[PDB]
Design a binder for these strands. Structure first.
Ligand SMILES: Nc1nc2c(ncn2[C@@H]2O[C@H](COP(=O)(O)OP(=O)(O)NP(=O)(O)O)[C@@H](O)[C@H]2O)c(=O)[nH]1
Ligand SMILES: Nc1nc2c(ncn2[C@@H]2O[C@H](COP(=O)(O)OP(=O)(O)NP(=O)(O)O)[C@@H](O)[C@H]2O)c(=O)[nH]1
Ligand SMILES: Nc1nc2c(ncn2[C@@H]2O[C@H](COP(=O)(O)OP(=O)(O)NP(=O)(O)O)[C@@H](O)[C@H]2O)c(=O)[nH]1
Ligand SMILES: Nc1nc2c(ncn2[C@@H]2O[C@H](COP(=O)(O)OP(=O)(O)NP(=O)(O)O)[C@@H](O)[C@H]2O)c(=O)[nH]1
Ligand SMILES: [Mg+2]
Ligand SMILES: [Mg+2]
Ligand SMILES: [Mg+2]
Ligand SMILES: [Mg+2]
Ligand SMILES: [Mg+2]
Ligand SMILES: [Mg+2]
Ligand SMILES: [Mg+2]
Ligand SMILES: [Mg+2]
Ligand SMILES: [Mg+2]
Ligand SMILES: [Mg+2]
Lengths: 219, 239, 219, 239
RNA sequence: GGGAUUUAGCUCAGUUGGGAGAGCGCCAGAUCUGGAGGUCCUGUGUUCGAUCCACAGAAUCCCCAC
RNA sequence: GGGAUUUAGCUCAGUUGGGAGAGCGCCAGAUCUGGAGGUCCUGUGUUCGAUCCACAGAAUCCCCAC
């Protein structure tokens, strides 16, 4: 039946980025006392989960970059000899366990994981793009929370065709000041190393002094 | 993007196998009984059941032993994508086990996909069952050696070179009878959907109609898969 | 560098169908004295190539079904322990070599190969569909040869929106009787086994007595 | 469809390695010289050159020895699809070799993709070069043993257990000096694009302009890749 | 298989070789003068020189088909 | 992330539970009477019973974005 394990020896090459994304977290975390659209306790649990992975997994990622509900790990030293299945599964499992511990959950959750096969000159770009994501879902989800506070379809159809700037305007004219909101909501959090430090006020990756920041983070 | 493994798909029927990472030593360090702890096996079976119950996936049944679980699938989510299924299932299992055991430090399952033909599905489990037995003899053997002062590597080598009969002998001389030990240690546990006949009232027909209800059952005294009564057992599990 | 061979141990499960398709054969076979749109010598070389594979490769396919420029082999006994790269490459290479021999080529040709991971109840269907292909390219390519005997774009734009039946009609009204054309052009050729036989007058797979034909071919 | 491997892609830089299937025995049976035939090596180099010249693919360079060829790629057709590249290249190489050798019975190349980092590309070839040497000592050794009546398996075992120095000794006592044998047997052949300076007339400028032209060259006396003059050689090949 | 299309962020022009333009949108000062912005889809050839020519491909569209 | 759509070969209707319809196209005899054709996108639940209800997904479309 080892011959039937047809993906077990499929591999990747360094460097690789593993992105783990919470699976169906909108319905699995509801029921708890989480604030919307951002909960400090939850983001804290995510950063602590990434830190837990860096400290206890033994797989040695260079660093983690998280913004709920996702975490990206950078690897130059591939775990399990670069085997895709084993890396994805084991890492996702570790994160599920760790997050479950930090939140003291009564019912199980699950992460998904995937390998992004970057070339080392593309590593900054990746994170930049990821940070870009962190911005959109920061704006939009606040707007969607400003509205609906409206039904699903209604609050949705107000936001259609509207660009980020008029979302800013609408949000302020509803009493929400995005520009002053915490940096971890807008940009995310970086966990790295030696002692393990969580950085909750990181710069924009594609800028000064954001470029050398990421560059030192990569070595 | 560069997610070059994201479109990798498998075609059911398929068995997913999850195996605890560095479990022997972690369980050893947390104070569990050696080499077998029934609380742990209970946690494994319950984790399998919780997966069958609340994962959103539909495994036909689970077969668990030691630190591993095998799920049978004839239908998969995420269009059968390998990364998705492996990561999500392994994660759910890690989380669930962490809950069942009230762990304070994180554990992890490895997970893999085993692509099978229909006519191949019994064979698989048979092989797995052998492994259970293979583990059952090893785990105890090792234990009995380590008790009397033999080092780890020497004990492992010993078990590797010694044949099963000799290990039975050595085990028996030291007060351990492998034939009297519980069945779940030697064969593992089957978690499945046992069907039962019910009946209710059809108001349109104005009559009583019979129907089926399935209950998630844990079988801790399973037969040998390749035995006489083992074959139709497994065949009914596969259906 | 074995760790960098990231596809070398990727596998398939039985049964599998390998389809090999001539790569860029329209431009690689032109220059020789091949008739259009069908050359008996070439189809003969293809069938002989498949037979050569069945006889000399040692990989034991159950049977081959060919219609230029493609060959499908059925395998229940996977070569090279089901390794995808090795099967595709080795088989395609063997076919390239064999075809090059049978045609006595001065310049190299190449096949592509791919694995179709069928389940054994889907094996008839596959070939049926393949035979369906053999029909379209039989009709169309004759039409395209009836025309242009017109420029590329012109002869093309005559055929647009026209269905198979009016292509039949047009072809006859140009002096081409499709219904009477050789069975190997319409349906293809089956090579199997014991002595190795080429069947140049096979039935339609999805019919009687086409169903039991294929069924005995599969055992 | 069920073509579940068809979308499998690789990301350049990448090296493709092709290796003749059952070549030792086929070459043996066709009457080629043992354990080295220069006509054969010529056919291999010429096949590599013909691949560089007319395959439609753009390998930076080829490195061939024994029955294997490695091509360096920084750009691939079919969007890097594995099945496509492996099958098409292996097929082209089989056909080309069949032509160069005027074979009457078919041969076949196996082919595989080796995914590499830029900074990794030298290392690869170095390892391959080692293998060349490893083959060079084996092929001869085997030969000399088989000459004097030692069976196949016994000879293989002999070569496996005996260290390289001992094999050198045994070889030398029987009249074979591995140091005087040709360089292409020990290091292989490099087929590449050697650049040369040309110059022509710009009619618009009304002046003479210099330019570059690349010629496919076969190097049969290559340096040791990890030697002093070997490093910039390989580095210029990779560029 | 067969026919096409691919050039600025968007919609398009432009020829068969000396390396590129309009309108919308964009920044700097609802209309004018100021701007930025390009891999002419990729690689390799040919050529003194390629957006244009030759070869092998890529992406998207249409026909045949089911 | 957010909003949708998915039912005959094609274009669509139909409700919140007793298991399904029109028009085009199709076969049998340019218009009428004769027909065939269904996995109500998948799996699992709930229910005596699911196209409809609950959960996890799939495919396609739109918004945000770059
Ligand atoms: N103490 C204890 N050990 C158990 C129990 N059930 C299984 N084990 C141990 O779990 C181990 C499983 O072996 P295996 O998975 O191959 O190794 P592992 O220790 O998990 N490490 P890894 O799988 O990462 O290589 C066996 O050695 C067995 O002794 C239990 O109830 N108690
Ligand atoms: N007679 C002869 N043999 C050669 C020549 N060049 C290489 N060989 C043989 O080619 C063989 C290549 O080894 P290898 O590829 O591992 O084995 P193989 O025989 O091709 N079989 P396979 O690769 O299918 O397992 C060597 O054993 C070597 O002796 C040559 O010019 N003449
Ligand atoms: N009539 C027709 N032939 C087609 C169509 N698509 C592909 N073919 C032809 O069918 C044969 C086999 O197709 P196949 O190789 O599976 O697909 P392909 O389009 O060549 N793509 P690829 O080879 O890259 O996977 C080839 O001759 C191919 O050109 C189509 O829509 N219509
Ligand atoms: N704003 C926005 N978010 C998107 C879009 N597509 C995906 N996302 C979100 O971005 C995050 C990461 O996306 P990713 O997981 O890579 O893709 P996905 O769409 O979830 N697909 P899959 O997980 O199946 O690969 C998720 O929260 C996902 O929902 C989009 O078009 N716009
Ligand atoms: Mg996702
Ligand atoms: Mg999520
Ligand atoms: Mg997310
Ligand atoms: Mg184990
Ligand atoms: Mg384990
Ligand atoms: Mg093709
Ligand atoms: Mg072809
Ligand atoms: Mg074809
Ligand atoms: Mg070799
Ligand atoms: Mg070989």
């Amino acid at each position: 039946m080892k011959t039937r394990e047809i993906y077990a020896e499929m591999r990747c090459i360094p460097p690789v980025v593993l992105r783990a994304d919470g699976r169906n977290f909108k319905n699995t975390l509801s029921g708890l006392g989480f604030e919307k659209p951002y909960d400090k306790t939850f983001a804290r649990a995510m950063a602590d989960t990434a830190e837990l992975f860096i400290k206890k997994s033994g797989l040695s990622p260079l660093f983690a970059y998280t913004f709920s509900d996702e975490i990206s790990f950078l690897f130059t030293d591939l775990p399990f000899d670069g085997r895709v299945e084993k890396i994805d599964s084991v890492v996702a499992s570790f994160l599920g366990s760790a997050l479950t511990i930090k939140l003291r959950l009564e019912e199980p959750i699950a992460f998904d994981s995937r390998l992004v096969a970057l070339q080392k000159e593309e590593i900054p770009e990746y994170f930049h793009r990821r940070q870009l994501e962190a911005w959109r879902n920061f704006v939009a989800s606040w707007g969607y929370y400003a509205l609906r506070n409206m039904g699903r379809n209604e609050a949705a159809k107000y936001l259609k065709r509207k660009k980020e700037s008029e979302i800013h305007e609408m949000l302020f004219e509803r009493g929400i000041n995005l520009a002053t909101l915490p940096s971890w909501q807008r940009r995310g959090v970086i966990i790295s190393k030696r002692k393990i430090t969580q950085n909750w006020e990181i710069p924009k990756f594609k800028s000064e002094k954001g470029i050398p920041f990421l560059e030192k983070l990569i070595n």
